[PDB]
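Budget justification note: compute hours in this period were largely spent on complex prediction jobs such as the one shown. Inputs:
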Amino acid sequence: CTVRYNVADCSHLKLTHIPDDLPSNITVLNLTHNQLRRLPPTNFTRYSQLAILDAGFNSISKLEPELCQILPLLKVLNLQHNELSQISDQTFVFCTNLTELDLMSNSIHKIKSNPFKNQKNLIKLDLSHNGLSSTKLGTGVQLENLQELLLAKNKILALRSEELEFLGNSSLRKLDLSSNPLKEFSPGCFQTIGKLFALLLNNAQLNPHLTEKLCWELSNTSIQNLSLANNQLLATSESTFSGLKWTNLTQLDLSYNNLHDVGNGSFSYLPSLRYLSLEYNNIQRLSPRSFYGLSNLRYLSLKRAFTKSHPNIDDFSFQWLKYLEYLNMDDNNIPSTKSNTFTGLVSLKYLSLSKTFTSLQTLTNETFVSLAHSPLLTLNLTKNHISKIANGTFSWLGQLRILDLGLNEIEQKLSGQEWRGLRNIFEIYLSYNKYLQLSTSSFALVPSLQRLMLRRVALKNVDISPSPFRPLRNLTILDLSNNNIANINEDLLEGLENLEILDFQHNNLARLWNPGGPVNFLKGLSHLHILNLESNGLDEIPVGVFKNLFELKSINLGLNNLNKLEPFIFDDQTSLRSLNLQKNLITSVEKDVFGPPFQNLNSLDMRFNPFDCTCESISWFVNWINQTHTNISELSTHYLCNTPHHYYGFPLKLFDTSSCK
Amino acid sequence: QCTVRYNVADCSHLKLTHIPDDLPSNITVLNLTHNQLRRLPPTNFTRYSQLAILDAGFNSISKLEPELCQILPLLKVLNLQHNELSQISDQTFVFCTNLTELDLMSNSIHKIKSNPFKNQKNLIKLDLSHNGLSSTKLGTGVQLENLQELLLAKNKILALRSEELEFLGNSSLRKLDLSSNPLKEFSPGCFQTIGKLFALLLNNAQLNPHLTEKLCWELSNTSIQNLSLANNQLLATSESTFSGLKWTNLTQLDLSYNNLHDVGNGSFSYLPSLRYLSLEYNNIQRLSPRSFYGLSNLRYLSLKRAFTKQSVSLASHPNIDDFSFQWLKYLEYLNMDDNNIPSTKSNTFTGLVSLKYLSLSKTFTSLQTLTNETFVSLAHSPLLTLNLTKNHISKIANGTFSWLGQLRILDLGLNEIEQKLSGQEWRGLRNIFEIYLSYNKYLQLSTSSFALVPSLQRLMLRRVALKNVDISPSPFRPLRNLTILDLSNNNIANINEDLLEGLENLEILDFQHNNLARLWNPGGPVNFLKGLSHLHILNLESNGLDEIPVGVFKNLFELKSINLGLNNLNKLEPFIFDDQTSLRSLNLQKNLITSVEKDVFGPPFQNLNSLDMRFNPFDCTCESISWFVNWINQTHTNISELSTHYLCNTPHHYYGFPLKLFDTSSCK
RNA sequence: AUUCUGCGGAUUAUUUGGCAAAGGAAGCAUUGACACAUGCGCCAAU
RNA sequence: AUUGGCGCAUGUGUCAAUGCUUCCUUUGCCAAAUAAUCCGCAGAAU
Ligand SMILES: *[C@H]1O[C@H](CO)[C@@H](O[C@@H]2O[C@H](CO)[C@@H](O[C@H]3O[C@H](CO[C@H]4O[C@H](CO)[C@@H](O)[C@H](O)[C@@H]4O)[C@@H](O)[C@H](O[C@H]4O[C@H](CO)[C@@H](O)[C@H](O)[C@@H]4O)[C@@H]3O)[C@H](O)[C@H]2NC(C)=O)[C@H](O)[C@H]1NC(C)=O
Ligand SMILES: *[C@H]1O[C@H](CO)[C@@H](O[C@H]2O[C@H](CO)[C@@H](O[C@H]3O[C@H](CO[C@H]4O[C@H](CO)[C@@H](O)[C@H](O)[C@@H]4O)[C@@H](O)[C@H](O[C@H]4O[C@H](CO)[C@@H](O)[C@H](O)[C@@H]4O)[C@@H]3O)[C@H](O)[C@H]2NC(C)=O)[C@H](O)[C@H]1NC(C)=O
Ligand SMILES: *[C@@H]1O[C@H](CO)[C@@H](O[C@@H]2O[C@H](CO)[C@@H](O[C@@H]3O[C@H](CO)[C@@H](O)[C@H](O)[C@@H]3O)[C@H](O)[C@H]2NC(C)=O)[C@H](O)[C@H]1NC(C)=O
Ligand SMILES: *[C@@H]1O[C@H](CO)[C@@H](O[C@@H]2O[C@H](CO)[C@@H](O[C@H]3O[C@H](CO)[C@@H](O)[C@H](O)[C@@H]3O)[C@H](O)[C@H]2NC(C)=O)[C@H](O)[C@H]1NC(C)=O
Ligand SMILES: *[C@H]1O[C@H](CO)[C@@H](O[C@H]2O[C@H](CO)[C@@H](O[C@@H]3O[C@H](CO)[C@@H](O)[C@H](O)[C@@H]3O)[C@H](O)[C@H]2NC(C)=O)[C@H](O)[C@H]1NC(C)=O
Ligand SMILES: *[C@H]1O[C@H](CO)[C@@H](O[C@H]2O[C@H](CO)[C@@H](O[C@@H]3O[C@H](CO)[C@@H](O)[C@H](O)[C@@H]3O)[C@H](O)[C@H]2NC(C)=O)[C@H](O)[C@H]1NC(C)=O
Ligand SMILES: *[C@@H]1O[C@H](CO[C@@H]2O[C@@H](C)[C@@H](O)[C@@H](O)[C@@H]2O)[C@@H](O[C@@H]2O[C@H](CO)[C@@H](O)[C@H](O)[C@H]2NC(C)=O)[C@H](O)[C@H]1NC(C)=O
Ligand SMILES: *[C@@H]1O[C@H](CO[C@H]2O[C@@H](C)[C@@H](O)[C@@H](O)[C@@H]2O)[C@@H](O[C@@H]2O[C@H](CO)[C@@H](O)[C@H](O)[C@H]2NC(C)=O)[C@H](O)[C@H]1NC(C)=O
Ligand SMILES: *[C@@H]1O[C@H](CO)[C@@H](O[C@H]2O[C@H](CO)[C@@H](O)[C@H](O)[C@H]2NC(C)=O)[C@H](O)[C@H]1NC(C)=O
Ligand SMILES: *[C@@H]1O[C@H](CO)[C@@H](O[C@H]2O[C@H](CO)[C@@H](O)[C@H](O)[C@H]2NC(C)=O)[C@H](O)[C@H]1NC(C)=O
Ligand SMILES: *[C@@H]1O[C@H](CO)[C@@H](O[C@H]2O[C@H](CO)[C@@H](O)[C@H](O)[C@H]2NC(C)=O)[C@H](O)[C@H]1NC(C)=O
Ligand SMILES: *[C@@H]1O[C@H](CO)[C@@H](O[C@H]2O[C@H](CO)[C@@H](O)[C@H](O)[C@H]2NC(C)=O)[C@H](O)[C@H]1NC(C)=O
Ligand SMILES: *[C@H]1O[C@H](CO)[C@@H](O[C@@H]2O[C@H](CO)[C@@H](O)[C@H](O)[C@H]2NC(C)=O)[C@H](O)[C@H]1NC(C)=O
Ligand SMILES: *[C@H]1O[C@H](CO)[C@@H](O[C@@H]2O[C@H](CO)[C@@H](O)[C@H](O)[C@H]2NC(C)=O)[C@H](O)[C@H]1NC(C)=O
Ligand SMILES: *[C@@H]1O[C@H](CO)[C@@H](O)[C@H](O)[C@H]1NC(C)=O
Ligand SMILES: *[C@@H]1O[C@H](CO)[C@@H](O)[C@H](O)[C@H]1NC(C)=O
Ligand SMILES: *[C@@H]1O[C@H](CO)[C@@H](O)[C@H](O)[C@H]1NC(C)=O
Ligand SMILES: *[C@H]1O[C@H](CO)[C@@H](O)[C@H](O)[C@H]1NC(C)=O
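Corresponding output:
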């Protein structure tokens, strides 16, 4: 086994009998994932210390009351996915300290007597998928403190004020009841539960009426959370959840319900509902009176909540949710915004509209007008096919901090105005578009920027002076990867005293490092930590173009053509933590070059290079390898030598430098 | 100094100040052209009394004394083009009676008095163009006995008279140029006065349909055969236009670049002898059946860019209708490239029963699909050549060529063909030589694609994105007489050895750019190239090749040229080349070759002509370049750039070191 | 038979990653064709 | 000098060809996950 400290962990051993050869000084034992005859109730003397046991996923026929008295110190008994066809009270009579009881696949079709007239400390109690046709587990009031009764994937037909009353002052925190083909909730079938907090009627085929009816039985109860996922509420009315009026409801779920109708004031009865999920549903539209009722709601989810003859929500439909702060509407077909869509949400601080529109080709200055009085900080607009953003398009989103226009068709030339009004904007994720010609003023209007992504946006004109990023001083993270940036003059990046992370992966910045003076890129970004120049056409790192970058933590120059390392390219990276020069054309590893960075390094990576197995080359290196503990992955396979003949395909590591010096 | 060398003393652009005359007197020619020349010292030519001709043009020569001709009695060619010589009289050439070629092109000699050449009796070529001549007259007496070329073009002649032309009595001109001359009138009998006038060139002379129509009669009863009318304003023609030629014997006629919009009926009814006719670069609206009535002798017709642009919006797409070529029963070469003709008609080419060469490259605009009724017209025409490149052809249905029985060379390249050849598209090409089919959209092949035409010698399939060439048998299975095969730039995914089975004549094979990389342990390497004993030049440049497996070049004795450039090949298992002992040129440039051993490159290096392995990561140690560096020192197999592009890549002290300068005196 | 358990093997679909290659495009460099200039020296006719 | 013909050399632009670098897309193969279906060995439950 893994014999993990204290807790015995036997993963998958294809084990035969119940073993007792390892330590006897422990409190847990994993036997799960093994072939088990039955549980020897007496073979548990050598282990009189175990507190819990991972004993599920085994072929266990039956169990004797013996196993509980042999291990008085036992809180968790895991017996899920086992046989145990039938059982009575005897089995757990000696388990009074038990707190978590697990039985998931034991097809225990019926239950007689009061089987747990003992467990007083048992909270979790999963009895699901076991063929139970009833909920009853006794006629007396037991299970003093139980907080989870899992009965789902079972075949219960109904609930009565009688087969449920066995819980008297019993207060369940989470009562599961999924997959049960319930057709009726006998009156007062909840008034009999001590105090019922959570509930889960997932996949139980509920009719708008069974639902409408069930509600009243959920009245005057301490119920706060309720799940109705995967049912047939093809529609709802004010009368549907009418029964809940007498309740105190926090979260309500109605996802995956092919809900086509969401009648008026259907929720007029939840003046306390704070959370509501309408995910994956087919709603036709939302008139203004749609949400009348939820005046406490703070999180609304319409992820894929509409039909696909296009569906749409009209103005002043959210006017009632004056306390909502998180509105999600991803994966949908809504045409476009209206002049008054989001009118009313004066608390909205997080809004997502990823792949939510179909005809919003152009972002106009009248698009987000609705969100004028909403304290909006987040706005995801990815995947909307947005191809052009006119002036003042965001002027109303005064307090916006994180805006995201990625994975879109934007093809225009930022002239600083598109950001007119983003007073305090944090980051602007703008990666993955068609074309983004920049100008000298593109960002002058928003100098509050910290992160600016521009991945695969085919940038053009970044060589103009001053640097279009000139006004972005508080800028820390900047990404210009996968743009095939033709070229760029040093002016760029001038004054970014905070630029920490910079990405240039894939940008043919090749020739910029002789002819016309080597572009002393990266001047003074003292604070620059992780630099990325992977696959950039780099063939020659010129003398000291990494000077004064003391705080530079991670350099990545993979996928390049770099064999000519002028001694001293790395000098100030004496704080470097991880270097990457994989898939290059590196022949030799000298000390004047890789020395200083190798100093306090954490993990190096130079696999797949044409290593030369001679002493003018790998000598200093092979040794460092033998005598350093800087994590170097695959040193064993992918560090082979390429020359000369006798040393071809020879693991670089196994090179005796005992004949060299 | 000059170049001299063998009696033709050539002094190139030498910046020559004064006419130099050194010892190479034992010669017969001297080039002084392209140098700064004061004047020609008529006496400095004693040290050179042997010269037969002199390249003396493109120099600043003021004037010339009659002296230079008597100093060099042995003189046939006098080149004085692009020089000054403003004026001159008979004196200048009095001593040049042996002279046969006289050149004067840029000397602005505006007028000519007397009989300047009362001496030249052996002078044939006589170029006097761009010289400011306002007249053709060069004398009043009948001289220049035997002259075959009188070049007077780019001049300012206003007309030709039976008077200023008569100075040629029994004089028979073979080629009489008269281009750029602003001629407005041809005084009657202005040719009846030339002994015998064969050729003529009135290029860019601004001729009216009438000046033309008129000029014709003066060209009558003359010995005229060729006539050029390029760059004029014959915006149209009628039967009456060339009516004056009826009294002639006309071989070739040119009317290119004439914005000809009208080609009236029977405009050529008068040329029962014209064999050649060029209507290139013109704007003809259409060709009714009666268009070509008259040319029953024509054998070569050119309509290259000969019909008006397509309007599309103005619906003015020009076109020729049926039975318009019925008269040219003797034509054998018809060209109609660069045009807007809509498409073929059921009877377009009807009548051409001699047509053996036909070109229709970029001739059609709406011929998206080749139907079985397209080339019906060419049914009775002995067609051997057919270029259809650049027509946007995207689909060729069954029996599309059935009528072209005798076709040998067919070309459907640079087209949009996107269909799957199922052997039927070639139904009827009884004796077809080559099928150039490169540069199309997609050509899915089947097991029968070529079974119908086993007469194939060459089959090109460059950049046609072939698909399914791995099917068995090889779709080329029935092509036995096939010699040249090209499957380049198709990114052929893969292929099994079956392919090429039985091509005992396959000599040239091209595989440039086809990621055939991994084919050389997936179920064993593919014994591609089995038994093509007769394969001469093999090309596998840039093919992903990273490992040439053991002996996949066995029995290829007759293989002359292997090209494996742009690949990743450093692992050469001794003996990959054994039977290429006849190899003449190897190419393994831009690879990842470390070392050159003898067990590997030995046999081919034997009788080799030219090797090429530049740009590789050469290792400057003896386990590697040792045997090689020597071969270099002691072999004379032409190896280009051995000096620069054969540097070493390892180790450190030998990096960037010319491979050649490696002393193997410390090894072996 | 219906199913639970452990281990191993197979096929398909979707997603990703790597390698090789193709097409098109971008930046830089080289070469050749041509056109519009310039400076130097020499000349020619006014 | 006005206009022109030469000789040498230096410019810009357009077009075309070639080479290096790169990017986007696609194709072949391979690897890893996830899911669906299946098959073999071993023990078992009603
Ligand atoms: C507005 O909404 C958008 C969606 O509605 C938000 O975008 C979503 O962001 C999440 C989180 O970034 C994305 O999820 C993962 O995206 C990448 C891509 O996955 C790739 O790696 C997988 C690994 O197995 C592959 O299987 C995939 O095929 C694919 O190639 C992942 O790489 C991320 O995982 C990361 O996991 C750890 C966590 O830090 C890292 O260590 C890893 O290195 C790795 O990077 C993401 O979890 C999600 O794709 C995207 N939406 C979707 C589903 O498309 C958008 O961000 C939001 N705006 C904001 C900022 O609020
Ligand atoms: C039916 O008619 C077609 C035209 O209507 C004709 O099409 C072409 O035929 C061939 C190609 O198929 C072509 O050949 C000449 O042109 C190529 C291309 O050269 C290019 O590159 C040059 C680079 O410096 C550039 O200057 C040029 O401007 C041009 O863009 C040229 O390479 C050929 O010469 C080479 O030939 C050898 C190559 O095998 C080589 O070894 C030699 O050294 C030499 O360089 C040719 O000069 C024609 O020009 C195309 N026609 C036109 C006008 O487009 C079809 O071939 C014809 N079908 C048949 C076969 O009947
Ligand atoms: C074009 O036609 C011919 C070219 O073949 C040229 O004229 C021909 O000139 C010859 C002799 O000069 C003529 O010969 C005569 O032929 C007759 C007919 O058989 C014969 O009986 C006589 O004995 C004599 O030999 C010939 O007829 C004549 N051809 C024509 C036009 O009929 C001339 O170059 C051109 N035509 C003309 C005259 O413009
Ligand atoms: C959901 O409904 C209510 C949310 O608005 C809230 O009801 C609370 O009910 C208790 C009843 O025990 C009230 O407490 C009263 O307790 C005794 C009654 O015997 C009085 O002497 C006290 O003075 C006190 O008023 C609460 O006032 C009432 N909550 C409030 C402040 O509105 C519960 O959250 C839920 N009701 C239940 C338990 O079903
Ligand atoms: C939102 O306002 C932008 C800034 O005013 C505006 O920029 C565009 O228009 C201005 C003129 O209004 C251009 O600036 C210059 O204006 C003078 C005359 O006022 C012109 O002589 C000069 O040629 C130039 O046009 C900006 O250059 C121009 N931006 C670009 C690069 O197109 C926006 O147009 C406007 N909203 C949009 C996107 O239309
Ligand atoms: C000319 O090109 C093709 C060559 O014959 C020709 O083939 C296609 O049609 C034939 C029948 O004419 C198909 O042959 C078979 O026909 C029997 C009919 O009973 C089917 O049962 C059998 O499955 C098969 O289809 C060919 O399969 C089919 N394509 C090939 C050659 O695989 C074309 O029809 C003809 N050109 C056209 C499209 O008119
Ligand atoms: C919600 O109920 C209304 C019925 O009341 C009307 O609409 C309210 C939003 C409010 O504005 C009241 O003053 C109105 O009296 C449904 O509204 C329309 O009802 C008519 C009935 O003739 C129907 O034809 C329309 O389709 C409805 N929509 C329009 C054009 O206003 C509304 O349909 C109900 N919500 C849904 C769609 O279930
Ligand atoms: C050449 O002459 C034709 C008429 O002469 C021939 O036209 C053939 C199409 C055919 O009928 C043949 O038997 C006949 O000998 C002229 O074309 C006609 O021109 C008149 C104007 O006078 C118009 O009515 C038509 O465009 C056209 N009609 C016909 C019957 O073709 C024309 O002068 C010239 N051809 C062309 C179009 O250039
Ligand atoms: C309703 O939702 C779940 C139980 O179904 C609970 O969620 C809240 O408590 C969790 C701690 O266990 C937090 O991690 C969750 O983030 C939090 N929900 C939120 C605000 O996201 C919650 O206890 C249940 N009912 C309530 C509100 O008590
Ligand atoms: C964005 O600004 C306003 C939106 O408030 C748009 O409308 C105004 O623009 C012009 C002002 O003279 C006129 O064309 C409109 O009549 C005027 N209307 C309003 C709302 O007052 C404006 O068009 C938008 N910007 C543009 C032009 O794209
Ligand atoms: C007319 O044709 C050209 C004029 O440019 C010349 O060449 C002709 O004769 C050559 C010798 O047989 C051939 O090679 C040419 O193909 C042929 N040109 C033609 C007509 O196509 C020649 O000057 C002329 N020939 C004569 C005298 O008729
Ligand atoms: C190609 O073959 C002939 C060539 O003219 C076309 O015509 C024949 O086939 C057609 C049958 O649908 C009809 O046009 C006639 O039956 C016949 N014509 C004859 C010989 O008079 C034929 O249409 C073309 N191929 C097809 C059938 O599409
Ligand atoms: C970015 O730079 C700093 C740090 O974010 C911001 O300065 C803050 O605000 C004022 C400066 O005028 C002072 O209170 C402190 O210097 C900073 N306070 C802190 C620590 O948050 C500066 O205002 C920012 N620039 C922008 C986006 O306007
Ligand atoms: C291709 O191979 C040869 C090429 O010469 C062809 O045979 C010649 O052509 C005919 C055959 O019909 C004979 O009359 C000749 O005598 C043969 N050449 C000589 C003189 O030996 C053969 O027919 C062709 N094969 C195919 C399928 O086209
Ligand atoms: C729960 O248990 C008893 C019944 O056994 C019940 O009467 C009483 O209300 C509760 N006692 C507690 C735990 O306070
Ligand atoms: C001819 O030769 C003489 C010999 O002295 C020389 O001076 C003269 O320059 C030559 N002719 C010229 C001017 O070229
Ligand atoms: C050419 O010479 C004279 C010119 O006067 C002429 O009479 C004679 O007949 C011609 N020679 C021939 C062709 O016999
Ligand atoms: C219990 O398991 C052990 C396995 O080590 C075995 O030796 C012993 O015989 C078993 N006892 C029973 C129940 O027979």
